[PDB]
Amino acid sequence: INWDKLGFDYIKTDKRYLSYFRNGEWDKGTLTEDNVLHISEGSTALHYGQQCFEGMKAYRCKDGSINLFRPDQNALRMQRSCARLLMPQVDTEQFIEACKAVVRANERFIPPYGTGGALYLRPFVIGVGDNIGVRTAPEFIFSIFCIPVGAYFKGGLTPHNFQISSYDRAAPQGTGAAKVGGNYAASLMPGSKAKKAHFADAIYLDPMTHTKIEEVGSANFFGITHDNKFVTPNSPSVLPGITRLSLIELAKTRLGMEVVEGDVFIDKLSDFKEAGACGTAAVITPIGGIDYNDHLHVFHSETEVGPVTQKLYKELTGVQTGDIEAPAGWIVKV
Amino acid sequence: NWDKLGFDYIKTDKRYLSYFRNGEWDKGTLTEDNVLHISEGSTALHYGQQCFEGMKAYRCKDGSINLFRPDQNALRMQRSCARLLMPQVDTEQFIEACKAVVRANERFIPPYGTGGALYLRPFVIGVGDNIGVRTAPEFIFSIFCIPVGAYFKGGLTPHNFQISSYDRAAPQGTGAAKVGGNYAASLMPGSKAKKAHFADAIYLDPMTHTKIEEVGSANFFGITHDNKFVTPNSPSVLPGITRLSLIELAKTRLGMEVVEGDVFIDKLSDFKEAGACGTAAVITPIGGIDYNDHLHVFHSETEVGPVTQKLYKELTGVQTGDIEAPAGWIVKV
Numbered sequence: 271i272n273w274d275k276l277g278f279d280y281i282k283t284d285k286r287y288l289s290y291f292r293n294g295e296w297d298k299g300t301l302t303e304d305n306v307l308h309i310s311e312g313s314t315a316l317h318y319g320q321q322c323f324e325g326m327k328a329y330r331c332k333d334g335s336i337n338l339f340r341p342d343q344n345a346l347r348m349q350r351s352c353a354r355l356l357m358p359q360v361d362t363e364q365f366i367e368a369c370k371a372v373v374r375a376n377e378r379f380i381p382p383y384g385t386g387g388a389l390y391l392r393p394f395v396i397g398v399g400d401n402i403g404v405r406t407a408p409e410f411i412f413s414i415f416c417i418p419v420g421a422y423f424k425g426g427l428t429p430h431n432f433q434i435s436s437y438d439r440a441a442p443q444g445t446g447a448a449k450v451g452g453n454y455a456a457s458l459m460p461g462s463k464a465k466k467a468h469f470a471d472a473i474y475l476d477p478m479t480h481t482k483i484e485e486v487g488s489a490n491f492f493g494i495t496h497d498n499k500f501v502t503p504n505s506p507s508v509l510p511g512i513t514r515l516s517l518i519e520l521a522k523t524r525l526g527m528e529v530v531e532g533d534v535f536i537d538k539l540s541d542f543k544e545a546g547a548c549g550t551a552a553v554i555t556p557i558g559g560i561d562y563n564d565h566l567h568v569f570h571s572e573t574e575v576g577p578v579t580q581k582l583y584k585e586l587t588g589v590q591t592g593d594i595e596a597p598a599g600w601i602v603k604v
Numbered sequence: 605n606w607d608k609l610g611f612d613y614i615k616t617d618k619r620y621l622s623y624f625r626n627g628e629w630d631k632g633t634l635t636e637d638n639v640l641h642i643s644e645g646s647t648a649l650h651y652g653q654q655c656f657e658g659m660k661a662y663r664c665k666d667g668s669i670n671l672f673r674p675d676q677n678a679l680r681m682q683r684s685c686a687r688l689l690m691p692q693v694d695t696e697q698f699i700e701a702c703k704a705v706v707r708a709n710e711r712f713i714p715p716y717g718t719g720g721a722l723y724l725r726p727f728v729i730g731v732g733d734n735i736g737v738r739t740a741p742e743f744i745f746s747i748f749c750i751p752v753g754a755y756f757k758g759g760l761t762p763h764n765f766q767i768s769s770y771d772r773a774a775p776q777g778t779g780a781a782k783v784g785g786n787y788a789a790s791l792m793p794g795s796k797a798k799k800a801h802f803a804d805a806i807y808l809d810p811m812t813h814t815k816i817e818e819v820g821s822a823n824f825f826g827i828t829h830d831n832k833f834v835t836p837n838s839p840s841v842l843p844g845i846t847r848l849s850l851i852e853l854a855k856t857r858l859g860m861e862v863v864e865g866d867v868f869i870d871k872l873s874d875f876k877e878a879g880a881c882g883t884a885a886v887i888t889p890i891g892g893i894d895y896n897d898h899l900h901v902f903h904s905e906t907e908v909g910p911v912t913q914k915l916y917k918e919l920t921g922v923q924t925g926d927i928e929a930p931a932g933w934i935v936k937v
């Protein structure tokens with residue numbers, strides 16, 4: 271395995287976790303080598319979108335130990351996505367133990383310290399069993415597979431351009447705050463249209479008025495104001511990201527920064543001297559410019575990442591890998 | 605027992621199965637395996653990349669079989685597929701696959717006179733190993749069928765529905781495509797309405813919540829006091845084939861004007877009748893709509909209105925062959 275040339279691509283690892291919900295209960299779960307799921311043709315996950323997923327990383331530390339980053343936060347969010355779709359919830363200790371068992375079973379896929387790589391875990395819950403007619407499924411599967419991943423973009427931290435979309439990933443009172451498959455399906459065509467126009471992704475505005483930024487592709491938006499405040503959107507349809515939460519907490523408690531969670535108007539991009547997108551896969555994607563009504567707004571530079579973004583990226587990656595001592599409760603040693 | 609038929613999954617004998625790989629659909633096959641074997645990384649399971657259709661085949665009194673407007677399903681699934689970046693099934697391939705499933709499962713076709721039919725569920729799903737939101741490298745097109753009874757929502761008994769504060773779809777989302785995410789968004793709001801003793805939720809336009817868009821997973825129609833057939837038109841409404849059929853029959857057989865336009869929630873008094881239309885039940889009459897904790901009653905809570913009766917008579921009669929069909933609507937199997 272060439273650790274440096276790793277991207278964010280499916281690779282079949284050795285074992286995955288698999289657990290069935292039947293007759294009101296989760297089974298005890300197992301680790302299996304089979305990466306093919308065998309599910310009814312009538313699965314609600316395949317007909318009525320009854321599906322949700324999570325994403326988290328484990329990192330090799332310089333001292334050789336293994337950091338699994340904030341899996342409790344994934345557990346909490348998946349409990350909320352399950353509830354929104356009427357699926358049984360996986361309790362937090364069950365969830366974290368399953369994740370740890372998957373990491374333990376696939377340690378040979380963990381990229382070594384210093385490669386910038388990580389082991390990505392994909393838990394998901396899906397409605398299965400024979401069914402027709404929209405309702406919650408009679409059975410469910412909770413599974414977790416992992417893949418070795420490298421830098422999402424190669425070359426390191428560099429600015430990327432994004433394009434405002436006229437389409438919506440989520441409704442004003444829809445499922446946008448749950449990490450569920452229907453939000454992504456709504457993003458397929460808009461994302462494709464932004465990329466065909468040679469942008470990194472689409473940016474989604476609030477679905478009621480299209481006056482406020484909500485999401486950058488499948489990542490949260492942040493702007494850095496001229497007076498150095500970390501600003502990020504707040505609305506019922508924004509996905510509450512764990513990277514965003516982590517950056518908010520590090521900004522407040524480690525970097526001496528002010529945070530604003532509020533309305534980010536698309537007619538006021540001049541408020542920000544830097545901007546970026548955050549999420550588990552990309553960590554931080556710096557935004558060079560946003561194209562809106564066919565004009566490119568550049569915050570800082572098309573060629574250089576601004577210093578505040580660099581400092582946030584340094585802090586967050588340092589905590590993830592064990593080079594900077596983490597806040598209480600963030601790291602689970604595997 | 606055709607008498608107790610509802611809308612429930614039963615494993616029938618054969619289903620159609622076709623894979624898209626390397627830019628081409630295979631030639632299809634009929635299989636007895638009702639278990640799909642798909643990658644743990646399938647976009648159909650992670651990114652909602654899935655769509656489906658629904659149509660019925662009816663045993664006629666003369667022994668023949670009517671498949672109802674499968675071309676219209678073909679057209680809509682093409683649009684649903686395009687909206688989710690899935691490969692399309694051309695109309696002749698789709699219709700032939702539907703006919704093959706009907707012929708392979710004729711013993712599950714309920715006899716004429718029972719109200720039963722054979723319901724077909726085509727669907728297209730993204731499959732193959734993948735991570736990261738994009739269109740899948742492979743797809744499955746499958747069609748299975750089940751016997752269904754038309755009175756499973758009660759027949760022409762009226763029901764009460766409750767306006768929801770939630771949205772099934774965004775203004776510029778996937779609401780006009782028949783994809784699973786729209787249903788996933790409706791699961792909780794529909795459950796809340798049922799727990800409050802309503803038949804289902806009614807969804808308003810998502811931008812303003814002033815106009816009716818959908819009744820559960822069925823389209824809305826109203827009959828005005830001056831005998832116009834009115835149904836919602838918006839970029840987020842699902843364009844139903846039952847609704848399309850009722851519009852054409854209302855115009856050409858019942859001599860009514862059709863309005864496809866806005867159904868404002870504060871103008872419910874414009875309608876002497878209202879109903880919900882869709883493939884499985886055809887029409888469910890709306891006795892009442894609850895909004896702002898007040899129940900608006902259209903015609904009656906216990907009896908269906910006469911215009912709804914004429915519409916139901918005409919459409920179900922066309923479906924079963926008791927009434928001559930408009931040109932091209934019926935495919936004989």
Ligand SMILES: *Cc1c(COP(=O)(O)O)cnc(C)c1O
Nearest residue numbers: 488489490509511512513549550
């Ligand atoms: C998952 C996701 C994010 C980022 O969430 P993380 O928990 O940081 O990985 C942001 N926006 C959208 C729309 C997402 O789906």
Ligand SMILES: *Cc1c(COP(=O)(O)O)cnc(C)c1O
Nearest residue numbers: 821822823842844845846882883
């Ligand atoms: C499928 C569906 C309908 C009805 O469509 P038919 O083609 O008549 O079966 C109506 N509203 C919604 C939201 C639907 O999903």
